Amino acid sequence: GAPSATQPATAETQHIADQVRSQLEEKYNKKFPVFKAVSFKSQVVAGTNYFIKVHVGDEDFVHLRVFQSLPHENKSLTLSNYQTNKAKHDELTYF
């Protein structure tokens, strides 16, 4: 995907923003005096997320979250996140 051209916000966009305002207050304690959607861009996403347990020596492991976009023969990847100080038998939980 390639994000589209800048599009004007609609009533949906504002509904989405109203939801997000509450989430930002509740979990990241972020407050604003107004929260008015102005515009957006869209981006198609289609691929595979990998959650990978990697041994990094002795008792040490890390977990990786890596995204691989379509098509199937695409081999370029994005490291989206990771977890430090993981142990051998830890579960691969989403993050």
Add this chain to the structure above:
Amino acid sequence: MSGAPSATQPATAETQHIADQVRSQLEEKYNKKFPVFKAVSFKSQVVAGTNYFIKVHVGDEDFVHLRVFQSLPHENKSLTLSNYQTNKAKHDELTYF
């Protein structure tokens, strides 16, 4: 082909090729080379949907950018919050983040 994460699968050469490709970036993080970097196991999760980057006015000259995701199918109207950035300006581009 669910969006549910697969069960845990043992690493293959392709899993290792992924680990090799991202290793140096991670090694920057910890400021050191890993003596070893061996893929052991993985889960896969199909992702297919639309990201939206949304510019929000939060008063005066202050803006916020949001990244939200809407999964397929097209009739799904649920979106989840992926990331946000504060301290943005009216003419700041909606660039990926």
Add this chain to the structure above:
Amino acid sequence: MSGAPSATQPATAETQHIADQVRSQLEEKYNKKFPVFKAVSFKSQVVAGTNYFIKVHVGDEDFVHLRVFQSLPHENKSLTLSNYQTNKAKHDELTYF
């Protein structure tokens, strides 16, 4: 968000908008206008993967084109046959079909 077809869902205005948009094309088929064209129900199926258009030599100057589909995730190696065309030439473009 499976690739499994959903359960049957009653039609919504969006289902009807889809029916309206494709109606004239179908009406060409039957050589007549439908007096009515009312969406009743639907199933949805998420599709996400790679189409491949493959040129195959079948001897002398004769070729076949194939369309096959590979679903996500990336480690899926199963493909299914979607369409084929015979009577093609060595320099015929791999155009969608």
Add this chain to the structure above:
Amino acid sequence: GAPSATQPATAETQHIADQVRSQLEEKYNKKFPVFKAVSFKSQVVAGTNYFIKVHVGDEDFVHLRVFQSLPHENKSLTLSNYQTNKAKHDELTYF
């Protein structure tokens, strides 16, 4: 998606072609003296297929298969196939 540039066939491509040769003989009784993969293009596909039961008057219905590509705000559609002479209570089966 937009199909890629023409790529040369590999051993996989040939494995896929060998499978298809058998399917074409068995179901469409098509035989060839050779079946050698030469080249391919790829195309990303990501969207929703709709199978839709449409009333077309009195006892008459049709079933439609329509593809809607991402992004979510895309409203252009492709009629991929249809079934004639359907009845009211027929199941929406894949086709």
